[PDB]
Amino acid sequence: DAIEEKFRERLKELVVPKHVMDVVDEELSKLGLLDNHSSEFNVTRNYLDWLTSIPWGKYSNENLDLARAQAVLEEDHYGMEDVKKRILEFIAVSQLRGSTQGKILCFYGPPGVGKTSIARSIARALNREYFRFSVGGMTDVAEIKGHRRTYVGAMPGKIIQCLKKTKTENPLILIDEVDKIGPSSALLELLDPEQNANFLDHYLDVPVDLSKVLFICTANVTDTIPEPLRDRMEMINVSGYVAQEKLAIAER
Amino acid sequence: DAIEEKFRERLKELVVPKHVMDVVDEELSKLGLLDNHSSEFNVTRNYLDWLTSIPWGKYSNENLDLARAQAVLEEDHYGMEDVKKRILEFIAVSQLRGSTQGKILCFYGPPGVGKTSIARSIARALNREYFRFSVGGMTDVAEIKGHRRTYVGAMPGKIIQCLKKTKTENPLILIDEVDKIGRGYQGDPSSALLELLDPEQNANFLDHYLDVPVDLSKVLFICTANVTDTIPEPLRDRMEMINVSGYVAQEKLAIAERYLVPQARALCGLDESKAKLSSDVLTLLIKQYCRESGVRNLQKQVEKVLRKSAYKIVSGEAESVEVTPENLQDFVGKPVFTVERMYDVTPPGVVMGLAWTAMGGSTLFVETSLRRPQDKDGSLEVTGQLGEVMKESARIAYTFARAFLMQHAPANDYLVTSHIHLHVPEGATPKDGPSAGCTIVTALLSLAMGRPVRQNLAMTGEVSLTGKILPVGGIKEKTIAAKRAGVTCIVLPAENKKDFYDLAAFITEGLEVHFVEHYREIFDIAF
Amino acid sequence: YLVPQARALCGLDESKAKLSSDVLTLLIKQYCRESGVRNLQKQVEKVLRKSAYKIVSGEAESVEVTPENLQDFVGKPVFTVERMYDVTPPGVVMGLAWTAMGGSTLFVETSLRRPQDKDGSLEVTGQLGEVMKESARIAYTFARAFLMQHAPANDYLVTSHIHLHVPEGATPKDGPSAGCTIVTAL
Amino acid sequence: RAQAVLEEDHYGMEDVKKRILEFIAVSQLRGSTQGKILCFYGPPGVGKTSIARSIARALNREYFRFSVGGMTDVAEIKGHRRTYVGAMPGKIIQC
Ligand SMILES: Nc1ncnc2c1ncn2[C@@H]1O[C@H](COP(=O)(O)OP(=O)(O)OP(=O)(O)O)[C@@H](O)[C@H]1O
Numbered sequence A: 001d002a003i004e005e006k007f008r009e010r011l012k013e014l015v016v017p018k019h020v021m022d023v024v025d026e027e028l029s030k031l032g033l034l035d036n037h038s039s040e041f042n043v044t045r046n047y048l049d050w051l052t053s054i055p056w057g058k059y060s061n062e063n064l065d066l067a068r069a070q071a072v073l074e075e076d077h078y079g080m081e082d083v084k085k086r087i088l089e090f091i092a093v094s095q096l097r098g099s100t101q102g103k104i105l106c107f108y109g110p111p112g113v114g115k116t117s118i119a120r121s122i123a124r125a126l127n128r129e130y131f132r133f134s135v136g137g138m139t140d141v142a143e144i145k146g147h148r149r150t151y152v153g154a155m156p157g158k159i160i161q162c163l164k165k166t167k168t169e170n171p172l173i174l175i176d177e178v179d180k181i182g183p184s185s186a187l188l189e190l191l192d193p194e195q196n197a198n199f200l201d202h203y204l205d206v207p208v209d210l211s212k213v214l215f216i217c218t219a220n221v222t223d224t225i226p227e228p229l230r231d232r233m234e235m236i237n238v239s240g241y242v243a244q245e246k247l248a249i250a251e252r
Numbered sequence B: 001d002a003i004e005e006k007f008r009e010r011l012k013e014l015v016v017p018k019h020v021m022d023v024v025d026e027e028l029s030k031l032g033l034l035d036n037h038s039s040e041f042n043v044t045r046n047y048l049d050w051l052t053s054i055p056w057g058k059y060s061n062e063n064l065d066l067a068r069a070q071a072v073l074e075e076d077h078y079g080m081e082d083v084k085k086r087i088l089e090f091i092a093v094s095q096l097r098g099s100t101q102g103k104i105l106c107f108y109g110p111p112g113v114g115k116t117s118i119a120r121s122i123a124r125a126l127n128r129e130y131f132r133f134s135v136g137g138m139t140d141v142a143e144i145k146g147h148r149r150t151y152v153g154a155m156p157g158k159i160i161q162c163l164k165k166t167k168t169e170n171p172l173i174l175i176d177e178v179d180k181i182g183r184g185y186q187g188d189p190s191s192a193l194l195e196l197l198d199p200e201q202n203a204n205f206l207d208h209y210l211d212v213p214v215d216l217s218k219v220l221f222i223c224t225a226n227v228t229d230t231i232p233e234p235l236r237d238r239m240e241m242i243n244v245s246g247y248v249a250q251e252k253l254a255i256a257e258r259y260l261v262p263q264a265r266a267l268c269g270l271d272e273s274k275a276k277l278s279s280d281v282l283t284l285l286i287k288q289y290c291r292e293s294g295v296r297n298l299q300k301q302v303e304k305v306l307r308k309s310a311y312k313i314v315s316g317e318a319e320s321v322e323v324t325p326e327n328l329q330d331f332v333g334k335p336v337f338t339v340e341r342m343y344d345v346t347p348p349g350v351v352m353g354l355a356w357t358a359m360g361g362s363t364l365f366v367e368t369s370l371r372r373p374q375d376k377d378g379s380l381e382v383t384g385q386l387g388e389v390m391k392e393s394a395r396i397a398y399t400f401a402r403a404f405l406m407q408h409a410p411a412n413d414y415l416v417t418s419h420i421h422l423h424v425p426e427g428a429t430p431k432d433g434p435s436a437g438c439t440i441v442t443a444l445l446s447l448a449m450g451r452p453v454r455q456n457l458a459m460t461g462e463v464s465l466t467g468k469i470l471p472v473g474g475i476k477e478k479t480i481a482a483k484r485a486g487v488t489c490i491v492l493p494a495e496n497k498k499d500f501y502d503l504a505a506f507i508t509e510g511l512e513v514h515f516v517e518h519y520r521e522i523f524d525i526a527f
Numbered sequence C: 001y002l003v004p005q006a007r008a009l010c011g012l013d014e015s016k017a018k019l020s021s022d023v024l025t026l027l028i029k030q031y032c033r034e035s036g037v038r039n040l041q042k043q044v045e046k047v048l049r050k051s052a053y054k055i056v057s058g059e060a061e062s063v064e065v066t067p068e069n070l071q072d073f074v075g076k077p078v079f080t081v082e083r084m085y086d087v088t089p090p091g092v093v094m095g096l097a098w099t100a101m102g103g104s105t106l107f108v109e110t111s112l113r114r115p116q117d118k119d120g121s122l123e124v125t126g127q128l129g130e131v132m133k134e135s136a137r138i139a140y141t142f143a144r145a146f147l148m149q150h151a152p153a154n155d156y157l158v159t160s161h162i163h164l165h166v167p168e169g170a171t172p173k174d175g176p177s178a179g180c181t182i183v184t185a186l
Numbered sequence D: 001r002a003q004a005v006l007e008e009d010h011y012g013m014e015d016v017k018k019r020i021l022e023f024i025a026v027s028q029l030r031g032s033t034q035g036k037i038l039c040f041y042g043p044p045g046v047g048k049t050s051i052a053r054s055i056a057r058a059l060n061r062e063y064f065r066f067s068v069g070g071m072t073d074v075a076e077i078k079g080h081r082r083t084y085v086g087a088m089p090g091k092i093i094q095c
């Protein structure tokens, strides 16, 4: 009985949308009619735990000051003009529209130029939560879409794991080595803005809103990405360093 | 016992069929005999709840007015005339008959043309409920069929959950990316889609969890696919496939300035007066940066320009941004497409051909040159990453060129003895297809006679061994490329007359066109 | 079966949209050339629904589907040319091939590669499969033998360089069914 | 009567109709309800699935459709042991 209150209290601070609240309270009503030792009770318990742990309507308080963000960006990296200009434009648009926004960037270039590090520094500068998602070598769609609740084991996929971990609806997600993927058709739904806002997971069975998630993909070569997947992303090039720039980086 | 009254109160509003009513009564009696705590009681209660909540015999109030439906369809998408005509025909047919109807459509075409969003616009126009079922990459057939009640956590499936969620028995189901369906180890989902999308068997679609047929004959299924040939033939036979073609630059300008720019302004918050994107700027941007058939990169370019202007304004660098064709490169960067014609004046050995490419049409030049000083027999060497079909076409062209030159100018032994080398520039780009046969024949003959072809003539078409010109595909892209490159005269196979005249009026206004049945006509035209 | 059922589904009385036997024959021979039936049903449904839209929108009160204006209802014909050569020049022979979209015909084309008519040679093109190339070699040998015995003085096949082509070079073709056609062409 | 019933629904499938008429003749020579197993194979859209209902009408037999396409569960064929909570005898026994 106390588990019902434990699930209920998680929704006090959240702003649960209507179509999610209906599922939540129908499972609440269902749970009272099952004995504790039954397996259906266990699966309903897990489903309620997953539904009530999603940060519905929780947004990290981003900083929209161009000066402070620029000072942070130069503090960590040297001479990556294109990425810094892109982030400044992102912050400018967010400030002008008065609300947070999501974008799909793709930093591609030779290894060792600092793509992962600049992504971490961007997450720190924007005051967003950060999460690594290594797609390199992934071969099963279950990592992104999960399995049905019927199976003994079940996952809501790595994206819902990120949502639970970061406790925010607008984190910064690093999807690295998109050119070394095995499969890719699950990523289209994840990062297609026409359906990104209603990403549906096979375990949750309820669509979550990922339109505010800032996806930052990194790759080494651009031709290996499938054309439909390459079409949905903004390709930003990170160039190699000349000897003078390498000397400056080493000194600083 | 009160739960039985609840189930009755939920059923009695519905037009339940006889067999469903019998099953519900049987399970109600079975639940009545069971106690309140047994697991079988919980299973029976959940099954009867699933049977109850499904909307038997109730339909959404579908709209039947042609004018407002056409307006709603026009609010969101431009130029998708085939889909709009299909929807209007659907509405007219549903209006003539007394009841709503369901069909199985499939929109296919290149990416970024609007197949996904047009589904939503159609659902809004028809006033039907909308559901997006993304089967791309899916491999679990249980998503379509589900599991029996014997299993611990069985659920019906995606379609039955759609019916429960929408509370209507005639929703709009978008089976997104049906061509990307996964032939995995856990069954074959396409084999289940065969019966899900069977026009006759939809009335008796049977779900494993329910074990009761469900009438899906009024559900409107829309499938989206980028490529057709990968869909299984039994499944491809059931669907009514209609093509969503790409957009020409004339259409892309209207699409941009009517939909993309206002939406991008709303997203970025900029006013019209703060940053103006004039029509000429958009035309230049489309010409030099957005040659593809999709509209998902023009949108990115427009967003880039607008976000750069927004950063310029908010940082205080300026109160307004004046985008001009001169300074556009400062916002969008380096132009991508600059040169459209490699040869301004053609030397004797070259002929300007046409080619089909993904990013609009293209023009290729067939280059020939003598390889050894003296004009045992002659031989031909081909380079330029030609495919096997292109190599066979080159061999046939060489044989016919020899025959034609022997018949026309018996004293000219150039093609019989000389060692020829044929090359197609842009050697890094592979190329295939028999469309260049007549181009190769003309190149060989012009080299042999030492006469350059007409300075603005482009030709395409397969050539047989006896000189007949055969029809070729990709007429639209080739015509667009020829018009772009300043071609004034174009030669096409005579069997492509229907394909050429079906093009839009503004695409073929300035082109002199000759239709040929045999190569001698092309020879008379070129020289 | 299909026309009455489509009329019942679309609600059009026979007097509102006439579909004669000749227009159905033309539609079948131009568009519905496969072995199944579903495509024919879809074409009939398209014609009837277009007539229904014409009637509803007030454009007309009666629709006549003549053989001339069937293109306005269905679009571009899919099959138009039945044979490539109306009269065969000396070097070609008409053949027959199996295809999924009903039967089809192929022409075997031969011509000289060098002017003089040392040993002769045969070049085979047309995306022919291994089996049909092997049959072409067999046909070349048998044609040599047959012309040796029939007309001893004819040295054409023995010394001339011959190119043999089967048109529609983009279409892959295979099978030994064309051996006699190749022999007769040579 | 069986030939008339078969003709009014489908056209031109002479082999299947002849097979059904032979089945009726054999079932008529010996007074028993004969049962056989038949497989219909061919290109899509020829009338395999549809002819089933017409044959059932001609034979005056009950008709049931059991589509196994994409099915991976043997429990549909064989059911489950009655020890389990929600065991059911499978599709054939329910038919
Ligand atoms: N401009 C820079 N200023 C300072 N340090 C830099 C700069 N560019 C790269 N580095 C450093 O170089 C290293 C590169 O590590 P990192 O993992 O970010 O590289 P990467 O190119 O993104 O890698 P990969 O392609 O393997 O994912 C880090 O130690 C990073 O701090």
Ligand SMILES: Nc1ncnc2c1ncn2[C@@H]1O[C@H](COP(=O)(O)OP(=O)(O)OP(=O)(O)O)[C@@H](O)[C@H]1O
Pocket: A194, A228, B076, B077, B078, B079, B080, B110, B111, B112, B113, B114, B115, B116, B117, B118, B224, B225, B226, B255, B259, B295, B296, B299
């Ligand atoms: N004719 C058009 N008029 C207006 N906007 C259009 C048009 N065509 C495409 N768009 C816009 O371009 C984008 C294309 O997205 P959408 O998902 O609809 O494309 P798609 O070709 O169906 O994609 P995919 O096949 O990869 O799923 C959307 O923002 C859509 O609004």
Ligand SMILES: Nc1ncnc2c1ncn2[C@@H]1O[C@H](COP(=O)(O)OP(=O)(O)OP(=O)(O)O)[C@@H](O)[C@H]1O
Pocket: B200, B234, B237, C001, C037, C038, D009, D010, D011, D012, D013, D043, D044, D045, D046, D047, D048, D049, D050, D051
């Ligand atoms: N001989 C026929 N006479 C009349 N209608 C026919 C005939 N053959 C097929 N049809 C009709 O054509 C359609 C074919 O549907 P059907 O279910 O019979 O397909 P099928 O041949 O079994 O194909 P699949 O292999 O795709 O399941 C139905 O509408 C059926 O009524």
Ligand SMILES: [Mg+2]
Pocket: A115, A116, A176, A177, A218
């Ligand atoms: Mg990395």
Ligand SMILES: [Mg+2]
Pocket: B115, B116, B176, B177, B224
């Ligand atoms: Mg889509």
Ligand SMILES: [Mg+2]
Pocket: D048, D049
């Ligand atoms: Mg069938």
